[PDB]
């Protein structure tokens, strides 16, 4: 059973700007998604300080980067707090309407796309490199769900029958044909070292057969 939703107009406009603006510094998508994972891990860690049972769904707090050249996907997995169905529908747990308003003002006031994370909407930088994004998520208080969008003004949500996750979020980037450098080990390592060197969780770059 698949539910299809329209993006709020302001979010559709944000996505269109990300997809259509000429902007060469696309590699920041990875910094933004790793930062979101770190924020999600901080949240479950904080809850666990007063309620250790919050980690019954998984004690390890980490980030995995999983390239797959056969599927043309880069997957960012974290064991953070995850998202409820309501969070997914409400712009993946962001205040994206107000964040977009500020971001678009800043761009007209001199800012560039790399600054997107200062406005709480860094997730959408995935569309710098991905033609489709799938988000699989499991929060302690809800079931496992899959969100997906190829932009174009709509997203879907369905219960996920795939591999159970325990707790956290998996962002699957279905890369554009001309963006496959982001599956190359040396390129990913370079981006992590440049932009994510102070993230306080282990970031494991998986290798391929
Ligand atoms: Cl990641 C990103 C890329 C482009 C823009 C933008 C806004 N206005 C023109 O381009 C914002 N964020």
């Amino acid at each position: 059973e698949v539910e299809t939703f329209a993006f709020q107009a302001e979010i559709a406009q944000l996505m269109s700007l990300i997809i259509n603006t000429f902007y060469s510094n696309k590699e920041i998508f990875l910094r933004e998604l790793i930062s979101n994972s770190s924020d999600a891990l901080d949240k479950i860690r904080y809850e666990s300080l007063t309620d250790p049972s919050k980690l019954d769904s998984g004690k390890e707090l980490h980030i995995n980067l999983i390239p797959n050249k056969q599927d043309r996907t880069l997957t960012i997995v974290d064991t953070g707090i995850g998202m409820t169905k309501a969070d997914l529908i409400n712009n993946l747990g962001t205040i994206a309407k107000s964040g977009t308003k500020a971001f678009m003002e800043a761009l007209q006031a001199g800012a560039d796309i790399s600054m997107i994370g200062q406005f709480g909407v860094g997730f959408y930088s995935a569309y710098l490199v991905a033609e489709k994004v799938t988000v699989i998520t499991k929060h302690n208080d809800d079931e496992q769900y899959a969100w997906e969008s190829s932009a174009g003004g709509s997203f879907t949500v369905r219960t996920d029958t795939g591999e159970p996750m325990g707790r956290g979020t998996k962002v699957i980037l279905h890369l554009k044909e001309d963006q496959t450098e982001y599956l190359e080990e040396r390129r990913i390592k370079e981006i992590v070292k440049k932009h994510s060197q102070f993230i306080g969780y282990p970031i494991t770059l998986f290798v391929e057969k």
Side-chain angles (χ1 to χ4, degrees), residues 17-18 21 103 107 113 116 128:
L17 181 149
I18 290 165
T21 301
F103 183 39
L107 292 175
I113 286 166
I116 186 171
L128 291 170

Side-chain angles (χ1 to χ4, degrees), residues 159-172:
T159 299
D160 185 47
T161 43
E163 199 61 65
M165 281 183 30
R167 187 201 56 251
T169 296
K170 178 184 330 319
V171 177
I172 307 172

Side-chain angles (χ1 to χ4, degrees), residues 66-120:
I66 309 176
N68 189 308
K69 292 178 180 72
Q70 288 63 231
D71 299 349
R72 213 168 74 210
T73 58
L74 176 63
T75 299
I76 300 91
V77 185
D78 66 76
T79 51
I81 195 159
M83 295 174 283
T84 65
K85 187 184 186 198
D87 290 320
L88 284 175
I89 293 163
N90 197 13
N91 299 310
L92 305 104
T94 71
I95 53 167
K97 180 181 192 281
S98 62
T100 293
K101 176 183 157 47
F103 183 39
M104 270 176 203
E105 286 174 12
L107 292 175
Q108 282 224 353
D112 64 288
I113 286 166
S114 80
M115 295 166 76
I116 186 171
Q118 298 182 46
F119 307 92

Side-chain angles (χ1 to χ4, degrees), residues 89-162:
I89 293 163
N90 197 13
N91 299 310
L92 305 104
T94 71
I95 53 167
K97 180 181 192 281
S98 62
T100 293
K101 176 183 157 47
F103 183 39
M104 270 176 203
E105 286 174 12
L107 292 175
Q108 282 224 353
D112 64 288
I113 286 166
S114 80
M115 295 166 76
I116 186 171
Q118 298 182 46
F119 307 92
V121 291
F123 167 75
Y124 299 93
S125 72
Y127 291 91
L128 291 170
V129 298
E131 52 179 28
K132 181 170 84 187
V133 178
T134 308
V135 177
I136 315 294
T137 193
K138 175 67 178 69
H139 186 282
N140 281 337
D141 298 338
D142 210 347
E143 295 329 310
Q144 188 163 309
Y145 283 93
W147 177 104
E148 182 168 85
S149 180
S150 298
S154 65
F155 64 93
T156 64
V157 178
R158 67 196 74 189
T159 299
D160 185 47
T161 43

Side-chain angles (χ1 to χ4, degrees), residues 21-36:
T21 301
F22 183 70
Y23 174 76
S24 294
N25 182 34
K26 290 178 178 290
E27 68 188 42
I28 63 91
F29 81 91
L30 185 56
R31 174 190 70 199
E32 289 320 308
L33 293 175
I34 289 173
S35 175
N36 288 352

